[PDB]
Design an enzyme around this catalytic site. Structure first.
Site, PDB file in Angstrom:
ATOM      1  N   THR A  97       1.270   8.900  -0.140  1.00  0.00           N
ATOM      2  CA  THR A  97       1.665  10.277  -0.509  1.00  0.00           C
ATOM      3  C   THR A  97       2.844  10.192  -1.451  1.00  0.00           C
ATOM      4  OG1 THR A  97       1.907  12.571   0.206  1.00  0.00           O
ATOM      5  CG2 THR A  97       3.147  10.881   1.479  1.00  0.00           C
ATOM      6  N   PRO A  99       6.185  11.718  -2.474  1.00  0.00           N
ATOM      7  CA  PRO A  99       7.250  12.546  -1.907  1.00  0.00           C
ATOM      8  C   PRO A  99       7.607  13.612  -2.960  1.00  0.00           C
ATOM      9  CG  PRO A  99       7.750  10.186  -1.644  1.00  0.00           C
ATOM     10  CD  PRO A  99       6.592  10.304  -2.605  1.00  0.00           C
ATOM     11  N   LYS A 100       7.827  14.854  -2.533  1.00  0.00           N
ATOM     12  CA  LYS A 100       8.051  15.995  -3.477  1.00  0.00           C
ATOM     13  C   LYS A 100       9.456  16.547  -3.335  1.00  0.00           C
ATOM     14  CE  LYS A 100       3.425  16.263  -4.138  1.00  0.00           C
ATOM     15  NZ  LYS A 100       2.991  15.645  -2.858  1.00  0.00           N
ATOM     16  N   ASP A 145       4.275   9.045  -9.116  1.00  0.00           N
ATOM     17  CA  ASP A 145       3.311   9.790  -9.961  1.00  0.00           C
ATOM     18  C   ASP A 145       3.641   9.438 -11.413  1.00  0.00           C
ATOM     19  OD1 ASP A 145       2.448  12.096 -11.646  1.00  0.00           O
ATOM     20  OD2 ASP A 145       1.632  12.878  -9.778  1.00  0.00           O
ATOM     21  N   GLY A 175      -1.463   9.093 -10.005  1.00  0.00           N
ATOM     22  CA  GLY A 175      -1.465  10.298 -10.812  1.00  0.00           C
ATOM     23  C   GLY A 175      -2.180  10.049 -12.113  1.00  0.00           C
ATOM     24  N   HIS A 202      -2.991   1.812  -9.109  1.00  0.00           N
ATOM     25  CA  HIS A 202      -4.176   2.390  -9.772  1.00  0.00           C
ATOM     26  C   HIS A 202      -4.268   1.680 -11.128  1.00  0.00           C
ATOM     27  CE1 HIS A 202      -3.912   5.254  -6.603  1.00  0.00           C
ATOM     28  NE2 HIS A 202      -4.798   6.080  -7.115  1.00  0.00           N
ATOM     29  N   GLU A 205      -8.501   3.106 -14.491  1.00  0.00           N
ATOM     30  CA  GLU A 205      -9.267   4.375 -14.297  1.00  0.00           C
ATOM     31  C   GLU A 205      -9.788   4.937 -15.636  1.00  0.00           C
ATOM     32  OE1 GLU A 205      -5.924   6.145 -11.942  1.00  0.00           O
ATOM     33  OE2 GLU A 205      -7.629   7.283 -11.214  1.00  0.00           O
ATOM     34  N   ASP A 281      -9.863  10.200  -1.870  1.00  0.00           N
ATOM     35  CA  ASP A 281      -9.523  11.593  -1.485  1.00  0.00           C
ATOM     36  C   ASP A 281     -10.712  12.185  -0.745  1.00  0.00           C
ATOM     37  OD1 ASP A 281      -6.953  12.010  -3.231  1.00  0.00           O
ATOM     38  OD2 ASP A 281      -8.455  11.270  -4.654  1.00  0.00           O
TER      39      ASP A 281
HETATM   40  O1  LIG Z   1      -8.255   9.396  -8.267  1.00  0.00           O
HETATM   41  C1  LIG Z   1      -7.027   9.486  -8.353  1.00  0.00           C
HETATM   42  N1  LIG Z   1      -6.341   8.940  -9.440  1.00  0.00           N
HETATM   43  C2  LIG Z   1      -5.029   9.024  -9.669  1.00  0.00           C
HETATM   44  N2  LIG Z   1      -4.170   9.605  -8.870  1.00  0.00           N
HETATM   45  C3  LIG Z   1      -4.763  10.164  -7.790  1.00  0.00           C
HETATM   46  C4  LIG Z   1      -6.106  10.134  -7.468  1.00  0.00           C
HETATM   47  N3  LIG Z   1      -6.321  10.814  -6.282  1.00  0.00           N
HETATM   48  C5  LIG Z   1      -5.131  11.186  -5.892  1.00  0.00           C
HETATM   49  N4  LIG Z   1      -4.133  10.863  -6.782  1.00  0.00           N
HETATM   50  C6  LIG Z   1      -2.710  11.131  -6.693  1.00  0.00           C
HETATM   51  O2  LIG Z   1      -2.380  11.551  -5.378  1.00  0.00           O
HETATM   52  C7  LIG Z   1      -1.807  12.892  -5.413  1.00  0.00           C
HETATM   53  C8  LIG Z   1      -2.341  13.719  -4.268  1.00  0.00           C
HETATM   54  O3  LIG Z   1      -1.803  13.301  -2.980  1.00  0.00           O
HETATM   55  P1  LIG Z   1      -0.248  13.398  -2.644  1.00  0.00           P
HETATM   56  O4  LIG Z   1       0.452  12.189  -3.181  1.00  0.00           O
HETATM   57  O5  LIG Z   1      -0.260  13.387  -1.133  1.00  0.00           O
HETATM   58  O6  LIG Z   1       0.341  14.707  -3.233  1.00  0.00           O
HETATM   59  C9  LIG Z   1      -2.183  13.459  -6.794  1.00  0.00           C
HETATM   60  O7  LIG Z   1      -1.261  14.420  -7.292  1.00  0.00           O
HETATM   61  C10 LIG Z   1      -2.222  12.203  -7.673  1.00  0.00           C
HETATM   62  O8  LIG Z   1      -0.981  11.841  -8.207  1.00  0.00           O
HETATM   63 ZN   LIG Z   2      -6.971   7.299  -6.475  1.00  0.00          ZN
END
Ligand SMILES: O=c1[nH]cnc2c1ncn2[C@@H]1O[C@H](COP(=O)(O)O)[C@@H](O)[C@H]1O
Ligand SMILES: [Zn+2]
EC number: 3.5.4.-
Length: 340
Positions: A97, A99-100, A145, A175, A202, A205, A281
Site C-alpha cells: 500500500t 501511504p497517503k 508511487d 503507480g 514493477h 509494464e 488488484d
Molecule cells: O497494475 C498496476 N500497475 C502499477 N501500479 C499499480 C497497479 N495496481 C495497483 N497499482 C498501484 O497501487 C495503488 C493502489 O493501491 P494503494 O497503494 O493501496 O493506494 C495505485 O494508486 C497504484 O499506484
Molecule cells: Zn501492479
C-alpha cells in the site's frame, strides 16, 4: 477444479486499494453521494464502465482514493482484504500500500499506516500473525508511487524502517509506469536496500528498454509484471535469478499481454526461473488468487502435484524472516499428500 481453492497459497503482489470488495466500494460511494461530496451515479458509472486498460486503470485509482482515503476506511479495507485472502487459504500475504498524506483530515503517511495496523489488529474471523479456524501470516510493503519526489520516497523508506516492529519487510515502486523517471526513485530505493529492506519493482509494464535494464542492474529482490521484456532483458533476469510476480488476469485486462497462451509465465516455468502467481488488484480485475491458479493450471496443463510444487516454491521468494519461512515449510509439508 475445487482443490485449487483449498491449496495453501502465498500472495506476494496485492495492492490494498485494488483489493476492495465491490459491495464495500459502492457502500462508501453511496455514503459520500448521500453526504453530497460526489455524485453517486457518475462514480457508479466509472466503477462499472472504465475498461481497465493501463491508461484507464490509473483514472480508476484516482476515483478509489477519493472514496477510501480516511483512517476508519483504511482500517476497514485492511481487515476485509486479509479476511478475503485467508478465506481462500492464502497462508502468507505480503500486502502492499501507498501511504497517503491528506492535510484536511490530519492524515500523514505514518497515521495512514497506523490505520493499516489497526485493521490488522481488528482481524477476528481468522487467526493472524502480522509481526513475530484459518491462520494467515501478514507482512507489509510500503509502495512508492511514480508520481512522488525523491524526498517523498525517502519519507516512505524512513517510515518503513520505523515500522519493522509491526511487520513492514519491504518497499515497492509502482503507480503509472508512464510517469516519473527511475533516476528519481533509485536513490531512495538504494537507501532502503542498504538498510536491509527487501525491494520489489514493477518492471516492463510498458516498453522502456533503458528503464528495464536499469531496474535489473539494481538487482531488486523481486520484480512485478515483466510484460515488455526483450531477449536481452530475459537473459539478464534469468542470470540474476530475480523472481517475477506474475499477474495473469491483470496483464490480459490491461492489454499488456495479448493472451494467457503467449504469456511469459510459461517460458519462465519451462526455464525453471522462479515465478509467483499474484492477483495484483483482485477488486479492480474481478479475480481471486484461486482463479489465477486455475487460469495457469489450464494454460500449462499442470497436475495437482506440479501445481502444489509451484505454490510451495514461493516460500523462498517471501521477504519474511527465516522463522516464518520455516512455519510455511511445515504448512506445505502437512498438505503435500493431498496434492496428487
Ligand atoms: O497494475 C498496476 N500497475 C502499477 N501500479 C499499480 C497497479 N495496481 C495497483 N497499482 C498501484 O497501487 C495503488 C493502489 O493501491 P494503494 O497503494 O493501496 O493506494 C495505485 O494508486 C497504484 O499506484
Ligand atoms: Zn501492479
Amino acid at each position: 477444479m475445487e482443490w485449487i481453492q483449498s491449496l495453501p497459497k502465498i500472495e506476494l503482489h496485492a495492492h490494498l486499494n485494488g483489493s476492495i470488495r465491490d459491495s464495500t466500494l459502492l457502500e462508501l460511494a453511496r455514503v459520500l453521494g448521500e453526504k453530497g461530496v460526489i455524485v453517486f451515479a457518475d462514480v457508479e458509472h466509472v466503477i462499472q464502465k472504465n475498461d481497465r486498460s493501463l491508461v484507464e486503470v490509473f483514472k480508476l485509482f484516482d476515483l478509489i482514493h477519493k472514496l477510501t482515503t480516511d483512517h476508519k476506511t483504511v482500517t476497514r479495507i485492511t481487515r476485509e482484504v486479509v479476511e478475503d485472502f485467508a478465506l481462500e487459504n492464502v497462508v502468507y500475504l505480503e500486502l502492499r500500500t501507498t501511504p497517503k498524506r491528506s492535510d484536511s483530515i490530519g492524515m500523514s503517511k505514518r497515521s495512514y499506516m497506523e490505520a493499516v495496523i489497526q485493521g490488522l489488529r481488528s482481524v477476528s474471523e481468522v487467526d493472524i500473525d502480522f509481526v513475530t479456524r484459518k491462520k494467515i501470516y501478514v507482512r507489509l510493503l510500503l509502495s512508492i508511487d511514480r508520481r512522488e519526489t525523491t524526498e517523498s520516497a525517502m519519507e516512505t523508506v524512513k517510515l518503513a524502517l520505523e515500522m519493522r516492529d509491526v511487520g513492514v519487510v519491504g518497499i515497492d515502486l509502482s503507480g503509472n509506469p508512464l510517469v516519473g523517471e527511475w533516476s528519481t526513485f533509485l536513490p531512495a530505493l538504494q537507501y532502503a536496500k542498504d538498510n536491509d529492506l527487501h525491494i520489489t519493482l514493477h518492471c516492463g509494464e510498458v516498453p522502456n528498454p533503458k528503464e528495464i535494464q536499469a531496474m535489473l542492474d539494481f538487482k531488486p529482490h523481486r520484480i512485478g509484471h515483466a510484460c515488455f521484456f526483450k531477449d536481452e532483458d530475459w537473459t539478464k533476469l534469468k542470470s540474476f535469478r530475480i523472481p517475477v510476480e506474475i499477474c495473469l488476469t491483470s496483464n490480459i485486462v490491461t492489454k499488456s499481454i495479448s493472451s494467457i497462451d503467449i504469456h511469459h509465465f510459461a517460458d519462465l516455468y519451462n526455464a525453471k526461473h522462479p515465478l509467483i502467481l499474484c492477483t495484483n488488484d483482485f477488486g479492480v480485475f474481478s479475480t481471486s488468487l484461486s482463479n489465477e491458479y486455475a487460469l495457469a493450471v489450464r494454460s500449462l496443463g499442470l497436475s495437482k502435484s506440479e501445481t502444489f510444487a509451484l505454490a510451495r516454491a514461493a516460500i523462498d521468494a517471501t521477504f519474511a524472516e527465516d522463522e516464518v519461512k520455516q512455519q510455511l515449510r511445515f504448512i506445505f509439508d502437512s498438505a503435500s499428500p493431498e496434492h496428487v
